Input
Amino acid sequence: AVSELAGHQTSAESWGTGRAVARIPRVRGGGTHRSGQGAFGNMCRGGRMFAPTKTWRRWHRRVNTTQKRYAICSALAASALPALVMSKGHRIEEVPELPLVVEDKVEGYKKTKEAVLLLKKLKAWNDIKKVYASQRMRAGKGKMRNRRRIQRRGPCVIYNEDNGIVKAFRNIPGITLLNVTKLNILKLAPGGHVGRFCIWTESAFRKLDDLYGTWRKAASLKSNYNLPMHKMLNTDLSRILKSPEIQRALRAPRKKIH
Amino acid sequence: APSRNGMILKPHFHKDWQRRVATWFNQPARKIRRRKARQARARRIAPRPASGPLRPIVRCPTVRYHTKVRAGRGFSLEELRVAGIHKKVARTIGISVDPRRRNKSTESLQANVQRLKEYRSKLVLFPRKPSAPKKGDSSAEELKLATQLTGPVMPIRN
Amino acid sequence: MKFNPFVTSDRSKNRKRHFNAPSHIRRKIMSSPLSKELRQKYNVRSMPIRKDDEVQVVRGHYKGQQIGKVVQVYRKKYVIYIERVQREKANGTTVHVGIHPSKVVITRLKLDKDRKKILERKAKSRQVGKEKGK
RNA sequence: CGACUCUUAGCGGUGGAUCACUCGGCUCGUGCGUCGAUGAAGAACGCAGCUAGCUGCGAGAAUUAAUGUGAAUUGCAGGACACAUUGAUCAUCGACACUUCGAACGCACUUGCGGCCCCGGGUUCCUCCCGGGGCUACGCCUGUCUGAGCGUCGCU
RNA sequence: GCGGGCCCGGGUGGAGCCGCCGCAGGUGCAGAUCUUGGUGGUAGUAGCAAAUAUUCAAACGAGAACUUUGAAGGCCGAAGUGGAGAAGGGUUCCAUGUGAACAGCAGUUGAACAUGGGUCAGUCGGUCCUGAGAGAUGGGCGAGCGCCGUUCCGAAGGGACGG
RNA sequence: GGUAUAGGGGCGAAAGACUAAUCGAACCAUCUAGUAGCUGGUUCCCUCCGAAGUUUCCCUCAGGAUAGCUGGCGCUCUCGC
RNA sequence: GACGUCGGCUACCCACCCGACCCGUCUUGAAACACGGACCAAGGAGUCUAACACGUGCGCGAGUCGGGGGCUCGCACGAAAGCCGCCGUGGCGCAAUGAAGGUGAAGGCCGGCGCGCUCGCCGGCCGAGGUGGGAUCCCGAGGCCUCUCCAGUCCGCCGAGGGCGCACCACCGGCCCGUCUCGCCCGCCGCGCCGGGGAGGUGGAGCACGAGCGCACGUGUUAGGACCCGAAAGAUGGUGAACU
RNA sequence: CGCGACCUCAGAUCAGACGUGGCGACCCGCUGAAUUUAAGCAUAUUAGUCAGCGGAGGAGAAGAAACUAACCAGGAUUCCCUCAGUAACGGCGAGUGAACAGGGAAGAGCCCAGCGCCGAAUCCCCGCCCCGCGGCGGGGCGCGGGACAUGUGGCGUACGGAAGACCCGCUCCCCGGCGCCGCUCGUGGGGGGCCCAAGUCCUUCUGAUCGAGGCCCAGCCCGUGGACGGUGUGAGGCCGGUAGCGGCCCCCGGCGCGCCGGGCCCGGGUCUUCCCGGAGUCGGGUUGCUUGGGAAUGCAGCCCAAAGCGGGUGGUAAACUCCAUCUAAGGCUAAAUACCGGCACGAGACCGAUAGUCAACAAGUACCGUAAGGGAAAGUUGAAAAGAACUUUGAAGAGAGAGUUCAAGAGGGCGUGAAACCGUUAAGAGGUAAACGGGUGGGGUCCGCGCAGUCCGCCCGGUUCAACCCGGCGGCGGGUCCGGCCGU
Output
């Protein structure tokens, strides 16, 4: 916000009708440049901006817990389907399997070199390779507002517990560490895009079911929560349209446009 | 000016409210400060419960509720006398005592006396000096549990 | 990244600190790396430059293999003047062209009682850190 | 084809517009949360080799002492230093010091007039004079000293 | 591309910038006798006309109508265009040097600029006294900063000779 | 020259004259970004639809409310099937 | 037709013919002898908070919610994010009507007992009524046929006609609360200035097998400075008799 | 005719201390309006607000019921949600507007007068000795003084207390000093100081690389360090730093163990006897202000003016009658609470020199007014001054050569240098002011052709292998679901 005293610190009075001036509050007297100039107006030099910004603007927004859970569940579901991950820009061409589950020995890792070797062996190192080229200079005032450097997002890493994995995967650019119990939608779907490349541990992958639950079992870690129901199950409409049941009750299409 | 069936309302914004607007941008910092102070107090009183003194069973006035049971300000003097606990010693042992409470019904008095009896039964009293004098508990039940009790001590459940 | 909440990591404040740092802080700021031989011998990565040290220019127009002696250290200009990095003015008089310490390598150190103890302290800390790493 | 005038383009004039930079602001949050008669806030006047302003300092006046660091400050000379020496510059600063007004304090505000003690010059306390040093403002608390009362009383 | 606008070519420039999917705003100017700053026609125009008046020769000087010197003619005509003060100004006073800027032309000149110098008290005045008046203590008022009043509801002289 | 009277106050041989180029109520700062049914202005393109100065009430007549004129969002149905 | 010849709708200058009065605004009427306007560059005016109303998008759904607090972190990313016997203290809705004492939403059919008395009391059954218009769904005679005559199960289209009838509209009834009139009976811990029940009109923002809660966005109305600029005035506290 | 006590009252430059003023973001006690709204305006609203005065701290105030409630009751104060825009107030209009309970943050209780018991058992000042003295204390010795009986100290205060009887169990709390072992959570408490990883590697551009390519695995090495800044561009590895239960040297704080000097003979329950309450105060009338408080919520000048099974409250005035709840007219107290001022920090979906504080720079500066007060404009050469030596015209300002720089086409108000406006060169034109729209024509600017441009793209005519087999590999589809998994 701007200071409340801005513009009104001066003592300006408007010259009435009878003078060539345009009825604007001007500075009283003096033998300086700023004398009979004009103040208290948004259009005047110095002046006071129209509708000054106030601190008590409604900065924060409230979101329903169920809606947030729905969004994070959708993001976790779209972490699969390699089409979405590739369309999000993550290079997973050499990944053996998109639900990349790794052993629990990663938590024992405490060296960034070990982390890099693990990423290279898992073939996720190409994403960090792309992030290194993506490192560049931001355009605009962000350079002088402590936002000078920008880079792409690397592969996310989900861990069940912190035993040194956070320390190991900390100097690698783009890597974001997430605990299963404390997953963040803002990091699972950067920029509002549902695609994301994630690397799971065995314990975290098994604990996902205890965190969210299946369709026939409660979460058992969230007091009252179940997965959202599908509006339509057979999502592939191409299979449905050319099914014998539908085509048995269709007229002959007319494509003899006159 | 009213326009085609709007609700008739009277906003209370005729004073200089902008000068007395109270923002809440310090809410998370205040929560962090309170959490730090609570942890510091818990570390200060190492074997004492984090919540604090025991609170008595209390019912509610205002027949609107009339059934809910909550924690009281302190144990009554008659309750302490029935339980055989001195009012001044109760403060030093960790029993909340207030001298304003009355006792009209016997059920509340007996419930509070039973609560005091249970608290003294499951109370471990460390000696004033390392060499244990009389009324001090045995060293057997001192090494096993020298930690705090999270949450209210003996929570009240309706 | 930096995790200490008392470090600045801000452009304006860091530039203000750098350009308004006192003389003793500027002495540490105007540090130059040691040669390969000196680094291998003393186990010191770099040392602050002195008035009369042998030095080679690595970057700039005066890049070369000449081992010139520093003439002076202008800490107000954040620069040093060395023996033979100079240019002739219009009137023919020679003036030393300033070279930043970061673009220069020390070939010979001026060893004093304070210099030797600084080298010893740096080597001891380096060895302690390496032992902790091992 | 002249001179003048109108339009467009190149170059050259007044102007500092746009963009890119920013030791600066605005807002939020955290810890601490401390002035003074042992002289506060503020003001005046002086202090550098060359010094006007800003900043710093107070006749010890671009700073004294001590600690930490360790070879400079620098616009020029002078240079002190032997940087194998408490040792150049800087930061810290706990010791010393801190001109005149200012609650401002001998009376007033002209920078004028004084009183009570001590010391030196002058003297041989000899009062003048000169210079230096300490006190001399109001209200109020405890205690001390000296006092007033046709106030209350007891003896002569 | 109807259009808001946009993509290439050339010249200057030297250090950051943009396309797409979403979010946010101090988001689009021809006017408000709009605010700030700059520039035009007017225009080389109005004007440099209040108080009689200048001329000759020489000197310095690159440069002379304005400086200096000498001579001639004039005015202020002792309630002066003279010689000293009070208030006010504060170095404007003196000498040297310069002609960047000012003296609405010019200037070798100046009260301009840069260097240096200048104010000497027992007797001249402040200092002392009181006038109209202002303003403390005592006292009164006042929520309070303070106000009322200068002899008024005061134990108001700390002085002096002699013993 | 000194001094006294200071703003709904002073002072006035009285003119509403003077009170620092202002006086039928001085100047500075704040409330204050005081209020205005009254002036003035109100910033890019294209496409579609597109008006009223009329009803009644109001210390109402340079204005509002109410119907009217208008736009948008739709929804329920019939069918050159 | 091809080494001084081609194409360049658009943009540079010039000429010709026709048309053509300077923009913005108040106004029934502006080119106006109506007002602002020399020119250029930069700035410049419907914003934000809160309360509503409607519409739209999402989540849950007779439920919905995160306000506040607590548990995880030393805040890079974070003052973010996750969780709570706090999961609901509490707000909205699920119940309304009276000033209030208060009351407070369902009936119908069948058999029996009192005289079926359009009234009361015992058991069983059906369980949100009815009419008209109602998108859609069901049955659907029969027809259309097939290289020949008959029989003939199947894939069909049309299908007169006959029905169950969503949502919604009009009406008739029914129920709850306040009120008016006429009237007859029920109960007892206290038999009374007790309490309850019926029928017929009427008033209500009501019931009649529900639709709300949270978030976001758009428009409109307001309180705030409130689209921007503009007064003549009023109050509080201080400064001026160097002019007069 | 005096002296000696006491009560009232003065003088001291008497001995030792205290207050004055400033800041004032937050707080406390007073005083206190009008613009505005009500479409006018007078009650109301703005508003216990601006302005004015006084007084402190790091917080202040408040605070442990003369309380809330009518319930099966709760139990100091303060803050958040809710109660609630509700009850209630208002030309009942505009508008104003709480409290109870409930859920949380925090949570700590107490002390006098009086009544009474103890030989005033109490306190202050001066002298000497010992410890220690930079927030002047402890003990001992003083027929050394003073205050106090017009009341100091111990017990004791509403939750009862005191004194005896005799039931029970037994003997630690604090102060002032002298030392000692553990560096004590952001994971080593606070402050200061000094240090801790890795390419200036080989080519290639540039004025200069921090640019581009490569270097036993995206490339060379570190990575608990890939934040940031500087360095002649865009640097993890050139430097300072960053990360770290990393290292070293000092000072301070508290938590703990030993010693000395001390003060301290400190309880619970039953029974018996006594005692226990703040006056010009409550309350009533009154009037003025205030409040939602309405036959008067609270604060008050004036008058009246108490009582003790008494007094207050129970949201409609009064009388009678039972109830429920506290004990006023005395005092202390941290915590959750606020903080546009002061010291030191961190951060930004904020502005980027007509913007952001008035002030990015010698800004409350220059300057204006007698004064209260008013109050600006003003950033950028260059990587490095390398800031143009020297010759020449001119008195000089100014040029012409020469030189530095990648660049002065960057020359001391010098980065980029637009428009209005002006000077000059080139072209065109010119008696209905200029200018504009539609349609052509003429001349230029260059653009795309060409030394023909006949644009090609498929089918047809005039060096090896497909065709066809062998071996290997991979892929698709299928059923006897063949066999096993999978799966509703």
In short: Chains B and C do not touch (no CB pair under 8 Å). The longest strand of chain B covers residues 57-59. The radius of gyration of chain B is 24 Å.
